[PDB]
Scaffold this active site. Structure first.
Site: not given
Ligand code: HEM
Ligand code: HEM
Lengths: 715, 715
Positions: A83, A296
């Protein structure tokens, strides 16, 4: 209406007035570190192994005010770093992790940055320990990098050197005054430039699909476009999403209306934290962040091929999270209990975002990801490269990358230039070359214009562009309209290449000169000539060391975003600018990192030097062109001239004398210096009787600053 | 909603957020003059006789774009200078001619400053000639001074030395978002503090009477009050009005709706000028400024007693100007044709403003002015004194007054101090006195708090207050609540006086020490002691030369406005502040000319030094009181502490540990440093493991700055 301490100001009376404060961002007085502080010198002495171990200790030590999913903060830190880097956009190079802006408004309070307030807070013990030797900017993305390594993913490398700032960079994130608002589309689905997110307060796309419609095919159109606008192609985009979602989980355990105000609107006692939830414990098992409840993979704290194995190994149907958000779950109760709970509860069923499904529904992403389902070593490679790119995209020249983890491999997106391979020109050779360039038959206008064209391609947002590389003779810069390819440009290039050839063949020793250094030196030599013509004997400073990039080192599509649609310093205004010419002047000056006085001297100087686009007479308020005088400022203040909009409504003005005869013509950019009360004050300095020596000095200092903008190799 | 270049920012999302930008007004980077520029050194060299002659040439050379009434711009320049000084107000000391703020927004566009855009433009030839040797700030008021002299009035004297600024001082001028709006009264006729004008965009009062009701008796109530709030008593106020209206005329030849937008809202081609009128020629005989059409005297370009002779020599009846403004005219056709026309037209009848009639209608003004009717030499004397006061009220210490025209006579309103009459304490005597003060039995808290109390009385707006004078022991400062007169103050005063006596009687030579220097030296000696207690051997800088004022040199009611209703540095909050405590902290820091880093280091240090009002434990986040540590910053960032509003809603907070036990208490001022994202960044600097030495160094520099605020005698 309000006290200045509560934000009241002159913008309240004149709402659309030119905001000159964009030219004094991060004032020295706001900086607590002091004049001699050098972050590069500090972080060069950091114990990287000890730092890694300390971050690893933080990741695996759960804190009661925000308990760690699966006893590992790693995945939270990956989202944090992603982010931080993910606000970057190619149109203006603004956003990105470069200044640690996520710690400040408005980014610290964006809906999409929910819970990252706690994420950053968890890392205070590390910042506390390393202090001056480690910026928050470096720490936020390094924590992400360490998280990946800690969980079994070998990264490509890492460069330190991101300097902390003390007030937020003011960036246009869109016109919407409602969070998640959308007023940024026209035509079929044309996203407003310079924006790179689909709604206000999102990183890229809506995780529930366009406008909350969970259509994976339609979502992929948004994914493709927004990621494109953050410098990622199809392979990189796919790699980043699967790589990221290989880890962790989303959070939406209860209704989102039980979540309190964002950090910047939260009460004092919350100490910079926001989104306080009244749902259950408000944390951990009860955590609400996005409102979606998806895990996931069966291995949220481990790198493996589980994401694609799951994505392709089940069929998916629409469902709703506890907070009412759209998400997908495996059909027919398949894979029941196979996904682990963050705090030891019962197992769960496979789940995916609508945007995750895009990866198998979109034809292009499907071919890429099916390949990786079968050959996951390719995914690991592509994700390493894309993640490296992501967290370094706004760092500029590789000279800026510091520390023992910087990889040897150069990458095309870094706009690389050759290393210096010979001895550099010294004082005698510089003097010789200046004389040779003045003897070449190239005019002052030609030399100044070309050097300006080359150097002013730099933007201080992502530190791309500039005169290093000699890219003025390469595509696309050689064909940019503002650089006027049908004019003298190719003649100037040819002449300087002939002088380079002559100098390099003729001079023995081991001294060689680059075309890149000659473009700049030509400008400096011409300014010396023009200063003498005005009765000033001055030497314009010059720092050699620029090298010549090949076309192969110069990504034409990537360089496209650096083309000016406006350059007030050359009185150029193309079509498609969001605001009137005078606003675009300040934007250009901001990107060139110029102060108001610096901007002012440069405009006045360049006009009389003949640097104007197509050598137009607009703003050339002098009788002696090719002479470095303060004539622009003196004439602008002359009350014997009456200014009127031109009869042809072409954005120009006529300056008539007492007889009614047109003496001068000017643009909005020219006249704003006499009209704007704060700029006029500066004109009145350089337009005074005693001011010519000062003007010449200040013009030369400002010129030198612009010539040197990308020169991190000597800084 | 907007681009930053068009004023968009974080205030748009969080409207009432703390604006830290008030702590970086006039940033160095906006200043075109450079680090080494020394205005005092430049203006010291001006030829004042030649300057006077050049201004006189300007006053008597009519320009066709704004023809001179009676062929003399003098009276226009008097109004200009009077309006430049007339924004001053005693409550915060802001406004006044000190910074040439009339040239910038919002003042350049105030309804009351109409036509002064042309007035200032007329003086460009003078500014052009003298350049860096003459600020606009000095020039604007000096032009008024010269005008008086050229038309037969001998002034008291004049001091140069007003430094030009490059961006407007942002000042609270009222709540009203409409020009001439009025939302600033409560009770019977209580005007909102800190305001000193009756409507938004007026200098003092409405010339047509309160809210346009032309009642001379009611008008005088407004005149009395607003002038009082600009430091003028009844005699001074009467002298100023009579003296001013002895010259020139008002302008209202046609309807005011034919007058175009004010300067800041006007088109680019008008080049900084506004109020362009389509009534006739729009200038000269057709000029409209206020909308009133009054010529007070038969000699508009000459000093004499005609104003009072006319005011008392006729009876007055209400009439209307061509623009429909209320004004008075002589009854019964008396004095027909006796008043000259500005451009050679037919003579006209005597006229007066409603506010001029106040001078004979109000009983107090009537006694003063009827006396001057028969004794004009007394008017001349009082106007000379009042005009001098007007043009210099915000100059601060007389050491700042420069040039050959500064009169010898000291005046009470200048808060004078004796000259240094003996040799100053040297390095050995300073070290000796520091030792003596530490042996005196006065505590660290007592010495630090007293030195703070004295020095922090300074405000950078009008440069009044500070530790020079030793006025802490005098009325009213000795009785101010924040200074805590019931506490140890009198004991500290007595001890330091005994040390002064001892040192002065004991030491032979020619060295004597002032009480004023001892108050500050005590603070310095105590911080040395406290730094030692925390393992730092440091010398706190100290510059002697302060002298001791007598009660007779100390105007008690004038000093009343300098009393803090809030001082966050001592965690003091009295009643009656317009905003919450954290906003009042920033206002205080602004008035002390402190940056955010300087404010931050000072709060943290003063807390642990025990400098708090009534030694309250609020924000005293240390186990070791009276030792100079960074404990405040370390503890503020401690996530083991949970903050909550106190059960008694007294504006305090409780900081509980893991046991639920209250470890700390704090105010809004204490917590804002952990809550505000930009301030927290600063505390994370001084709260780091490596930060103790830097904290001590920065605290000492900031402390020294505050001790030296009023010390213009040594700069
Ligand atoms: C189409 C692009 C993407 C969408 C729509 C998306 C959406 C989301 C959403 C909605 C969450 C949940 C946030 C929460 O409620 O805690 C999330 C978590 C997360 N995102 Fe993505 N994301 C995208 C791309 C990415 C990218 C590029 C990365 C890093 C390379 C990433 C890494 C992560 C990780 C590691 C989490 C888990 C965080 C945790 O465990 O607290 N995401 N993402
Ligand atoms: C009760 C306080 C005062 C009121 C209500 C007042 C009001 C006015 C007004 C309405 C004008 C007409 C401006 C125009 O239409 O061009 C004017 C002009 C003028 N004022 Fe005052 N004024 C006050 C005090 C003063 C003071 C204290 C001075 C200087 C010591 C002063 C000096 C002048 C002069 C010299 C002019 C004539 C300007 C010219 O000829 O262009 N006034 N005043």
């Amino acid at each position: 209406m309000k006290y200045p301490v509560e934000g009241g100001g002159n913008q309240d009376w004149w709402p659309n007035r030119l905001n000159l404060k964009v030219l004094h961002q991060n004032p020295a007085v706001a900086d607590p570190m002091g004049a001699a502080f050098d972050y590069a010198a500090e972080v060069a002495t950091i114990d990287v192994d000890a730092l890694t171990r300390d971050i690893e200790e933080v990741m695996t030590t759960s804190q009661p005010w925000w308990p760690a999913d699966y006893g590992h903060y790693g995945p939270l830190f990956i989202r944090m770093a992603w982010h931080a880097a993910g606000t970057y956009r190619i149109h203006d190079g603004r956003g990105g992790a470069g200044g640690g802006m996520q710690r400040f408004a408005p980014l610290n309070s964006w809906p999409d940055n929910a819970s990252l307030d706690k994420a950053r807070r968890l890392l205070w013990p590390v910042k506390k320990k390393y202090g001056k030797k480690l910026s928050w900017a470096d720490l936020i993305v390094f924590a992400g990098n360490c998280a990946l390594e800690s969980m079994g993913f070998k990264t490509f490398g890492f460069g330190f050197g991101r300097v902390d700032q003390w007030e937020p960079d003011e960036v246009y994130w869109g016109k919407e005054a409602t969070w998640l608002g959308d007023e940024r589309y026209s035509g079929k689905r044309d996203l407003e430039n310079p924006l790179a997110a689909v709604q206000m307060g999102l990183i890229y796309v809506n995780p529930e699909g366009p406008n909350g419609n969970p259509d994976p095919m339609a979502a992929a159109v948004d994914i493709r476009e927004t990621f494109r606008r953050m410098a990622m192609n199809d392979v990189e985009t796919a790699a980043l999403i699967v790589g990221g979602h290989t880890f962790g989980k989303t959070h939406g355990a209860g209704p989102a209306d039980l979540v309190g105000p964002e950090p910047e609107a939260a009460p004092l006692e919350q100490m910079g934290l926001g989104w306080k939830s009244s749902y259950g414990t408000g944390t951990g098992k009860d955590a609400i962040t996005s409102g979606i409840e998806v895990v996931w993979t069966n291995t949220p704290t481990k790198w493996d091929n589980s994401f694609l194995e799951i994505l392709y190994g089940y069929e998916w149907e629409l469902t709703k999270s506890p907070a009412g958000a759209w998400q997908y779950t495996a059909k027919d109760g398949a894979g029941a209990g196979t996904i682990p709970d963050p705090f030891g509860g019962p197992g769960r069923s496979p789940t995916m975002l609508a945007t995750d499904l895009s990866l198998r529904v979109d034809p292009i992403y499907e071919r890429i990801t099916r390949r990786w389902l079968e050959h996951p070593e390719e995914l690991a490679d592509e994700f390493a490269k894309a993640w490296y790119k992501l967290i370094h995209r706004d760092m500029g020249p590789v000279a800026r990358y510091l520390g023992p983890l910087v990889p040897k491999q150069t990458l095309l997106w870094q706009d690389p230039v050759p290393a210096v391979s010979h001895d550099l020109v010294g004082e005698a050779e510089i003097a010789s070359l200046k004389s040779q360039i003045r003897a070449s038959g190239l005019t002052v206008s030609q030399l100044v214009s070309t050097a300006w064209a080359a150097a002013s391609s730099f933007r201080g947002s992502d530190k791309r562009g500039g005169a290093n590389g000699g890219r003025i003779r390469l595509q696309p810069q050689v064909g940019w309209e503002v650089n006027d390819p049908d004019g003298d440009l190719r003649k100037v290039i040819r002449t300087l290449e002939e002088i380079q050839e002559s100098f390099n063949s003729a001079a023995p020793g081991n001294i060689k000169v680059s075309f890149a250094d000659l473009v700049v030196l030509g400008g400096c030599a011409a300014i010396e000539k023009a200063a003498k013509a005005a009765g000033h004997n001055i030497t314009v400073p010059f720092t050699p060391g620029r090298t010549d990039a090949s076309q192969e080192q110069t990504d034409v599509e990537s360089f496209a975003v650096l083309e000016p649609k406006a350059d007030g310093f050359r009185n150029y205004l193309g079509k498609g600018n969001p605001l009137p010419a005078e606003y675009m002047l300040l934007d250009k000056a901001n990107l060139l990192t110029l102060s108001a006085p610096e901007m002012t001297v440069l405009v006045g100087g360049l006009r009389v030097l003949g640097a104007n686009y197509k050598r137009l007479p607009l703003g050339v308020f002098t009788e002696a062109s090719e002479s470095l005088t303060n004539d622009f400022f003196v004439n602008l203040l002359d009350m014997g001239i009456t200014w009127e909009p031109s009869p042809a409504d072409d954005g120009t003005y006529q300056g008539k004398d007492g007889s009614g005869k047109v003496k001068w013509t000017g643009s909005r950019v020219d006249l704003v210096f006499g009209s704007n009360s704060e700029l006029r004050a500066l004109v009145e300095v350089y337009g005074a009787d005693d001011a010519q020596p000062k003007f010449v000095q200040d013009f030369v200092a400002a010129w030198d600053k612009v010539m040197n903008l990308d020169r991190f190799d000597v800084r």
